[PDB]
C-alpha cells in the first residue's frame, strides 16, 4: 500500500511541469544554496599550471511546482526523473576538463522534501586552472581559485549562496591533502560578480593557499651549487706552480656547474623570465667563471716553472692576487648568500 | 505571471520547424558573433597548434521565436537548443574541440522579444598554426581562428563581428608564460568559389616570444664558455697539459650544452637561429684549440730546422672575431 502511494506520487510530480523554465521566471530570483566537500585536493601540475580536485558538490533550492502530500517527508528520484526537472547550470569558470562520475551508476542524488525544497548532490572531478607567479621559485606561495556560477542565468534570475557560514561551507577532508610537492595551508571562501557580455553573474569562489616545500631544492640544486663554488675558491690555496692542476680544477668545476644548471632547469616549467633559482645558478656560475680568470692572472706573473722543494736558487713568492682572492671571493659569495636568503625568505 | 510565460513558450514551438532557416525564401540571415576568451592554455611548437578556451556566442533574429507581452528576456534551459535552428558554424583550424559538459552542457538560449536569440558555448578548441621557427627564439608568430559556415552560402547566411573591433574581448587579460600578444585583428570576408561566396570570420593574434629566458640559459653560458677557451692564450706553450685541458674540456662543455639544449628545447627538426649560434660558438672553441696545435707544431716540430707572435696575434683577433660574430648575428635576427 505504501509502495502504491509512492509510485502514485512519482507519476504525478511532473504532470504540468516544464523543465525549460526557471522556478519563478517572472516572480522572484532563485536562491541556490551551495556546499562543497573536498575529498582529494589532487596533483598540482606546475607545467600545465593547473590542479585537480575531487568534490561532493551539493546544491539546494526551492521549486514550488514539486510540492507533494504523502506519508513520507522526502523523495528519492531516478536519474530518468532527475533529468526531467530544472537543475541550475553550474559550470566552473576556470575548469579545463572536468569529469562527472558515473561508476557504477551516475553519482547524482535529487531529493524532494514536502515543501518542494530540492537537494542535489554530485560527485565531481574538476581539473581547474591555477595561474602562478613563479618569480620566487621555489620559495613562493600562491592561491589556486575554484570559481563556479550559473552559465545562462544572470543576477536577476539565479543567485548563489552557501548553506552555512562561508568559512564552514567548503570542508576539506582530513585525509584529503594528496600533494607531494606543496603544502595545503588553508582555504578562503568568498563570492563575487562578473560583468560578461551577457550580463552580471554571481560567482562563488574558493581559494586554496599553497606553499612549496623547498627541502628538495636545497639538497638537489642549492647545496651542490654551493659546494662547487666552494671548490673553485679552494683552488686558491694551492701553489702557483700547479699549472696543470689548477687548470684541470678550473674548467671542470665550470662543467660541474654546467651539469647542475641543465638538471635544475629540467625540473621546472618553461617560464620566460628569471626565477629565484635562475638568479642563484647564474651568479654561482659567475664565481666559478671568475675563479679560472683569477688563475689566468696568477699564471701570467709566475716567472718560474719549478716548485718549492721542502728542504730549501730562488723561488716564487705567493702572489698578492692569490692572497687577496682568498679573502675577497669567499666573502663576496658569503655576502651574496646573506642577501639571497634574506630577500627571498621575506617575500 | 508564470503560467502565461509557460503558455508563451509552448506556442513559440507550436508548429516550429527546425529545418527552416529564418526567412527561408527571403534575405540571408545575419549572424553576429561575439567571443569572450577565457584563456590560451598552451602554444605548442612541436604540434604546431594552440589551445583556446572561449565563450563563443552567436546572435541572430528568428521571426518564429518572437513574443509580446512579457517584458523580460526569456532565458531558457540549454536543452531547447536541440529544438531550434542553430547555424552550422565550424572552425577550419580545428584539430580537436569539445563543449564543456560539467555540470551540465554549457549552452545557453536567451530569447529576446523581437525574436533575437543568443546561443552561447564554452568551447575549448585546439586550432592549428603554420609556425615559422627559422628565427627561433627571436621570432614573432601569427596564429588564427577561422570561423566559417558549413552548408549555406552568402545567399542564405551572413556573418559579422558584433561591435566591430570590440567583438573579441579578454585578449589583454591573457598572460602567456612564454609569448606576448602584440595585436589581435578581426577580419570579415566572403570567400568566393566557383559555386558561391562563403562567409568567413577571422580572429588572429601576434605572438612575440619573450627572450629573457633564452639569454640566461642558452646564450650567456655559451658566451662564457667561449671566453674560457681564450685563457689558453695567456699561458706559455711549455705548459702543454694546461693548454690542452682548457681546450679539450671546453669543446666538451660546448658539447654538453648543445646536446642537452637539444633535449630541453622543443623538437623542431630544422635549422633555427639558436642552432646557428651554438654551432658558431662551437667553431670558436674548436679554432681556439687548433691554435695550440699550430703553436705546438711550429716550436717542437719546426724548431731544429715565431711562437709568441702567434699567441700575441690570437689574443686580439679571436675576441675581435667573436665580437664581430655577435655583431653579424644580433643584427640579422634582431
Amino acid at each position: 500500500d505504501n509502495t502504491t502511494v509512492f509510485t502514485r506520487i512519482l507519476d504525478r510530480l511532473l504532470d504540468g511541469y516544464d523543465n525549460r523554465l526557471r522556478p519563478g521566471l517572472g516572480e522572484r530570483v532563485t536562491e541556490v544554496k551551495t556546499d562543497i566537500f573536498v575529498t582529494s585536493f589532487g596533483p598540482v601540475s606546475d607545467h600545465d599550471m593547473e590542479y585537480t580536485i575531487d568534490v561532493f558538490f551539493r546544491q539546494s533550492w526551492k521549486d514550488e511546482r514539486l510540492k507533494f502530500k504523502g506519508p513520507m517527508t522526502v523523495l528519492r528520484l531516478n536519474n530518468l526523473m532527475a533529468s526531467k526537472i530544472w537543475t541550475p547550470d553550474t559550470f566552473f569558470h576556470n575548469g579545463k576538463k572536468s569529469v562527472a562520475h558515473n561508476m557504477t551508476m551516475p553519482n547524482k542524488l535529487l531529493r524532494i522534501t514536502e515543501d518542494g525544497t530540492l537537494l542535489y548532490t554530485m560527485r565531481l572531478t574538476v581539473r581547474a586552472e591555477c595561474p602562478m607567479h613563479l618569480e620566487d621559485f621555489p620559495m613562493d606561495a600562491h592561491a589556486c581559485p575554484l570559481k563556479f556560477g550559473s552559465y545562462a542565468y544572470t543576477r536577476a534570475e539565479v543567485v548563489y549562496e552557501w548553506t552555512r557560514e562561508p568559512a564552514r561551507s567548503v570542508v576539506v577532508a582530513e585525509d584529503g591533502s594528496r600533494l607531494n610537492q606543496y603544502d595545503l595551508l588553508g582555504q578562503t571562501v568568498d563570492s563575487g560578480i562578473v560583468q560578461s557580455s551577457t550580463g552580471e553573474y554571481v560567482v562563488m569562489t574558493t581559494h586554496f593557499h599553497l606553499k612549496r616545500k623547498i627541502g628538495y631544492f636545497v639538497i638537489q640544486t642549492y647545496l651542490p651549487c654551493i659546494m662547487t663554488v666552494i671548490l673553485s675558491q679552494v683552488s686558491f690555496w694551492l701553489n702557483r706552480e700547479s699549472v696543470p692542476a689548477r687548470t684541470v680544477f678550473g674548467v671542470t668545476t665550470v662543467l660541474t656547474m654546467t651539469t647542475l644548471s641543465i638538471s635544475a632547469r629540467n625540473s621546472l616549467p618553461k617560464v620566460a623570465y628569471a626565477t629565484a633559482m635562475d638568479w642563484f645558478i647564474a651568479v654561482c656560475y659567475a664565481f666559478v667563471f671568475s675563479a679560472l680568470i683569477e688563475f689566468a692572472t696568477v699564471n701570467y706573473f709566475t716567472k718560474r716553472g719549478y716548485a718549492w722543494d721542502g728542504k730549501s736558487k730562488t723561488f716564487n713568492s705567493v702572489s698578492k692576487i692569490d692572497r687577496l682572492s682568498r679573502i675577497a671571493f669567499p666573502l663576496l659569495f658569503g655576502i651574496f648568500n646573506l642577501v639571497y636568503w634574506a630577500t627571498y625568505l621575506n617575500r | 505571471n508564470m503560467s502565461f510565460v509557460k503558455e508563451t513558450v509552448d506556442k513559440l514551438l507550436k508548429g516550429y520547424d527546425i529545418r527552416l532557416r529564418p526567412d527561408f525564401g527571403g534575405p540571408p540571415v545575419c549572424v553576429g558573433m561575439n567571443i569572450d576568451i577565457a584563456s590560451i592554455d598552451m602554444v605548442s611548437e612541436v604540434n604546431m597548434d594552440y589551445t583556446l578556451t572561449m565563450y563563443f556566442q552567436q546572435y541572430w533574429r528568428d521571426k518564429r521565436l518572437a513574443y509580446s507581452g512579457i517584458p523580460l528576456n526569456l532565458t531558457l534551459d540549454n536543452r531547447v537548443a536541440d529544438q531550434l535552428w542553430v547555424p552550422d558554424t565550424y572552425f577550419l583550424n580545428d584539430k580537436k574541440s569539445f563543449v564543456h559538459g560539467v555540470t551540465v552542457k554549457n549552452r545557453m538560449i536567451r530569447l529576446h522579444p523581437d525574436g533575437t536569440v543568443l546561443y552561447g558555448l564554452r568551447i575549448t578548441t585546439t586550432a592549428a598554426c603554420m609556425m615559422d621557427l627559422r628565427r627561433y627564439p627571436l621570432d614573432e608568430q601569427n596564429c588564427t581562428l577561422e570561423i566559417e559556415s558549413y552548408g549555406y552560402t552568402t545567399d542564405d547566411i551572413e556573418f559579422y563581428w558584433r561591435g566591430g573591433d570590440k567583438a573579441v574581448t579578454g585578449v589583454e587579460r591573457i598572460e602567456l608564460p612564454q609569448f606576448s600578444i602584440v595585436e589581435h585583428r578581426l577580419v570579415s570576408r566572403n570567400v568566393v568559389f566557383a559555386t558561391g561566396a562563403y562567409p568567413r570570420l577571422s580572429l588572429s593574434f601576434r605572438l612575440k616570444r619573450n627572450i629573457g629566458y633564452f639569454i640566461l640559459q642558452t646564450y650567456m653560458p655559451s658566451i662564457l664558455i667561449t671566453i674560457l677557451s681564450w685563457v689558453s692564450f695567456w699561458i706559455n706553450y711549455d705548459a702543454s697539459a694546461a693548454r690542452v685541458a682548457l681546450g679539450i674540456t671546453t669543446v666538451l662543455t660546448m658539447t654538453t650544452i648543445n646536446t642537452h639544449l637539444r633535449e630541453t628545447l622543443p623538437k623542431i627538426p630544422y635549422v633555427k637561429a639558436i642552432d646557428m649560434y651554438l654551432m658558431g660558438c662551437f667553431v670558436f672553441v674548436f679554432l681556439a684549440l687548433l691554435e695550440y696545435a699550430f703553436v705546438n707544431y711550429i716550436f717542437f716540430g719546426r724548431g731544429p730546422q715565431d711562437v709568441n707572435a702567434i699567441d700575441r696575434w690570437s689574443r686580439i683577433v679571436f675576441p675581435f672575431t667573436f665580437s664581430l660574430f655577435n655583431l653579424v648575428y644580433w643584427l640579422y635576427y634582431v
Partner: nanobody
Framework: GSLRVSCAAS????????MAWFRQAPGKEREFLAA???????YYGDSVRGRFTISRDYAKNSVDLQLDGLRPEDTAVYYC?????????????????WGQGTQVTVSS
C-alpha cells in the same frame, strides 16, 4: 556627489595580479573596499557593496573605483593595492604593492 578615484600603475604589468582598493579612516584600520581578480570578478566589502564599483583597464594597466552615494562617513584615505592575495582578498598583509593615498573629504 560622485567621484572616480583612479590608480595608474607603472613598472610592472599587473594583469595577472589582483588590484584592490582599501580605506583607512582615523582609527588605523585599513578596511577592504573592492578588489578584482584577473577573471574580472568584483569582490566587495559588506559595508560598501552596491555603492562603489570597481573596474580594471588591463591594457593601460590601471584600476578604477567609481564612488557613488558618498555618505559623510567616507572621509578617509583610499589606498590602491596590487597583489596576488595569499590568505588574501580581504587581508591587508597580502598585497605587496601600495599606492600613495588620496585624502577624500566628504562634508555635509
Amino acid at each position: 556627489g560622485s567621484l572616480r578615484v583612479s590608480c595608474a600603475a607603472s613598472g610592472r604589468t599587473f594583469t595577472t595580479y589582483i588590484m584592490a582598493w582599501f580605506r583607512q579612516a582615523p582609527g588605523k584600520e585599513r578596511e577592504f573596499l573592492a578588489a578584482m581578480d584577473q577573471g574580472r570578478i568584483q569582490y566587495y566589502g559588506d559595508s560598501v557593496r552596491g555603492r562603489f564599483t570597481i573596474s580594471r583597464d588591463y591594457a593601460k594597466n590601471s584600476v578604477d573605483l567609481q564612488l557613488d552615494g558618498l555618505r559623510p562617513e567616507d572621509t578617509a584615505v583610499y589606498y590602491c593595492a596590487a597583489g596576488a592575495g595569499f590568505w588574501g582578498l580581504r587581508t591587508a598583509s597580502s598585497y605587496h604593492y601600495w599606492g600613495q593615498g588620496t585624502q577624500v573629504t566628504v562634508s555635509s
